[PDB]
Design a protein around this ligand. Structure first.
Ligand SMILES: Nc1ncnc2c1ncn2[C@@H]1O[C@H](COP(=O)(O)OP(=O)(O)NP(=O)(O)O)[C@@H](O)[C@H]1O
Ligand SMILES: [Zn+2]
Length: 384
């Protein structure tokens, strides 16, 4: 039921159109949908496997309606027309994550729906691209009885993915693993998952307090945004729970800084923190069109002829010569000397200096993967 092109042949029905268009986009395997306004006409385009195409040019009159409709679905400001807006939608087709972005433009806000699959995001702990060392130390870390483990990085770092991987590795029936999320990304099975619900003042803080009355061995908090959730988090870790969470800081040592700045007692950070996994996503070079070169003298400084690889571009990729992505990481492990450094508020430079004797930086991690020709030198250097 409900074909986009049929419904297009007639000039709400604006709800049946949007759903049908989404439905047709998914049927075609399209990555993105574009609704744009031009002075004398309107335009709908679909991107499929790189290729962009016009699929419909309905009357200019419809533009304000299709824009509004996508807004209300993504939970946004119908009134606001002058500034960018970004919403989310979860939908069942017969499950699709659709990211909608709008934008002021010379004849009407432009809109794109980003349409991602829910499943390609579901990776296990050995499939995130951790090096053998990081993998080993991280697996030994999440198996500890109590303390806080933070997964950190900027937006798009893949922090939710590595939490889920970690939880799944622990998901035995000997453990009681409870979760509070905003929202839940999916169901794991074996793990009690709890969504934050603003509609009843069920916040991260309230939910996490409740979790502790359910006798958990491990608890996950979707993220630590305010002092209050940090306070409970730290108390939970100090009373025999293993706690896992995220911050959006930019370095492993910056996690400590962020915690202090938020107002957690420096001593209490130093006695609860087990470790901080800082993390970035780099695109993996398309193995089909990736081209070998010989590193020049300046590129060598960063590391016989040294063979690295470069992007290029082909149909099997599209926009650039990259298919897929992988993680690069830095795993901070707390020891006696570092506790002193945290407690004494020594600062980022002194903590980093200490950690380097044992652990390589995210850049070195990235550079190793460049060496292996998994990714380009550009892709690693641009985030650094
Ligand atoms: N190791 C990995 N390899 C490939 N893809 C990954 C990896 N880790 C995460 N991803 C994907 O990258 C996207 C970002 O991951 P997500 O787990 O949503 O990140 P995040 O940092 O938690 N997000 P946010 O805090 O909302 O910006 C998702 O679409 C995941 O599929
Ligand atoms: Zn390619």
């Amino acid at each position: 039921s409900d074909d986009f092109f049929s419904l297009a042949e007639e000039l709400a029905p604006i709800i049946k159109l949007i759903n049908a268009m989404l439905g047709e986009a998914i049927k075609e395997g399209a990555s993105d949908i574009h609704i744009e306004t031009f002075e004398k006409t309107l335009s709908i385009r679909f991107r499929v496997d790189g290729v962009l195409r016009e699929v419909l040019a309905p009357s200019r009159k419809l533009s304000s309606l299709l824009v509004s409709r996508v807004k209300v679905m993504a939970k946004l400001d119908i009134a606001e027309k002058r500034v960018p807006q970004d919403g989310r939608i979860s939908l069942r087709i017969g499950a699709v994550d659709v990211r909608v972005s709008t934008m002021p433009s010379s004849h009407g806000e432009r809109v794109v729906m980003r349409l991602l699959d829910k499943n390609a995001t579901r990776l296990d702990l050995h499939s995130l691209g951790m090096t053998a060392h990081n993998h080993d130390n991280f697996r030994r870390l999440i198996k500890r009885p109590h303390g806080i483990i933070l997964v950190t990085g900027p937006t798009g770092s893949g922090k939710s993915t590595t939490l889920y991987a970690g939880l799944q590795e622990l998901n035995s029936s000997e453990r009681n693993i409870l979760t509070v999320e905003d929202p839940i990304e999916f169901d794991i099975d074996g793990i009690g998952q709890t969504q934050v619900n603003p509609r009843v003042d069920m916040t991260f803080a309230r939910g996490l307090r409740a979790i502790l009355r359910q006798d958990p061995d491990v608890v996950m908090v979707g993220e630590i945004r305010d002092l209050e959730t940090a306070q409970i988090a730290v108390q939970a870790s100090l009373t025999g729970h293993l706690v896992m969470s995220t911050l959006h800081t930019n370095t492993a040592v910056g996690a400590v800084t962020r915690l202090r700045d938020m107002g957690i007692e420096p001593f209490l950070i130093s006695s609860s923190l087990l470790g901080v996994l800082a993390q970035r996503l780099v695109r993996t070079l398309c193995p089909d069109c990736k081209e070998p070169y010989e590193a020049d003298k300046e590129q060598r400084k960063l590391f016989e002829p040294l063979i690295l690889y470069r992007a290029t571009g082909c149909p099997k990729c599209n926009h650039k010569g990259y298919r897929g992505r992988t993680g690069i990481h830095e795993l901070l492990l707390v020891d006696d000397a570092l506790q002193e450094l945290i407690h004494s508020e020594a600062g980022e430079q002194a903590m980093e200096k200490h950690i380097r004797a044992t652990t390589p930086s995210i850049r070195d991690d990235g550079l190793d993967k460049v060496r292996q020709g998994i990714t380009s030198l550009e892709e690693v250097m641009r985030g650094s």
